Amino acid sequence: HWGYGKHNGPEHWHKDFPIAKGERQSPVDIDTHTAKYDPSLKPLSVSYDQATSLRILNNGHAFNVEFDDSQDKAVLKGGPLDGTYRLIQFHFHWGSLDGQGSEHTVDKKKYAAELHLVHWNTKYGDFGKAVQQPDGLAVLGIFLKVGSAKPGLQKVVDVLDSIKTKGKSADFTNFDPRGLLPESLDYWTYPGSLTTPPLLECVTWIVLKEPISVSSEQVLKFRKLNFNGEGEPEELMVDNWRPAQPLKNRQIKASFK
Numbered sequence: 001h002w003g004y005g006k007h008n009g010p011e012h013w014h015k016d017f018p019i020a021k022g023e024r025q026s027p028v029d030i031d032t033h034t035a036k037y038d039p040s041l042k043p044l045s046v047s048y049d050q051a052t053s054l055r056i057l058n059n060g061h062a063f064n065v066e067f068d069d070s071q072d073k074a075v076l077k078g079g080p081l082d083g084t085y086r087l088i089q090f091h092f093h094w095g096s097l098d099g100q101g102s103e104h105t106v107d108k109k110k111y112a113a114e115l116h117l118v119h120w121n122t123k124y125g126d127f128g129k130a131v132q133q134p135d136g137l138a139v140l141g142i143f144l145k146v147g148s149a150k151p152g153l154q155k156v157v158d159v160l161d162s163i164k165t166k167g168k169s170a171d172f173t174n175f176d177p178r179g180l181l182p183e184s185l186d187y188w189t190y191p192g193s194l195t196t197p198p199l200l201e202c203v204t205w206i207v208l209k210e211p212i213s214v215s216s217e218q219v220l221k222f223r224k225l226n227f228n229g230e231g232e233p234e235e236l237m238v239d240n241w242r243p244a245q246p247l248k249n250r251q252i253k254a255s256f257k
């Protein structure tokens with residue numbers, strides 16, 4: 001099965017998922033000088049006041065904080081989007097060292113990690129149908145740099161010991177994802193894909209310009225997770241990021257001057 005090793009990592013994925021070599025793959029490098037300011041782009045509307053987290057899961061590739069998406073409770077609107085997208089889960093990608101870990105890059109800069117808040121377009125009824133559509137998902141990407149701690153991240157950090165290995169989950173209620181957002185909602189946007197198999201070309205990417213700061217201790221706890229299941233040879237969950245893919249025929253737009 002696919003993963004992030006020499007034998008099964010990103011350079012192998014195309015054999016089982018030929019769309020890996022497609023026309024709208026993610027992530028990409030964001031060349032800040034060639035991204036065009038688009039005055040037609042709207043402010044992003046992030047409405048997470050009623051978000052209901054349920055559970056946290058080690059799926060063997062990352063950990064997902066899952067939400068109740070059975071009603072319009074946590075939604076993303078505006079920005080480049082038409083209509084309403086409902087939050088289903090968030091997860092991160094991160095490195096073995098602070099100098100790598102993000103999927104998107106900015107003028108070739110790699111951040112220590114990247115948060116993905118995943119939302120599906122309500123016009124398709126649920127997530128599985130949405131991923132079959134070119135406007136099915138909106139993923140809000142937020143870079144992490146190492147410095148001061150992010151207080152709103154600590155509840156996530158502290159539960160990771162209980163989901164060390166693949167397949168473990170834990171109740172994770174009342175977590176407020178507003179605590180993971182930076183001050184500014186300035187963003188870049190482009191059409192792309194899931195960054196893990198099945199690599200479907202269904203995502204409007206919205207990447208925030210302003211990173212959040214997390215502490216070295218917080219990211220070190222991410223790096224204690226395991227890709228393996230319980231009682232299997234320990235493989236630390238690090239470097240679970242796909243490198244930048246060819247931009248091909250796409251334009252990255254900026255919401256800000």
Ligand SMILES: NS(=O)(=O)c1ccccc1
Binds near residue numbers: 118139193194197
């Ligand atoms: N990593 S990502 O593109 O946010 C993603 C989101 C949902 C499913 C698969 C991948």
Ligand SMILES: O=C(O)CCCC(=O)O
Binds near residue numbers: 014015016017018
């Ligand atoms: O299935 C594969 O081995 C990848 C190539 C398939 C294709 O490019 O259509």
Ligand SMILES: [Zn+2]
Binds near residue numbers: 091116
């Ligand atoms: Zn992701």
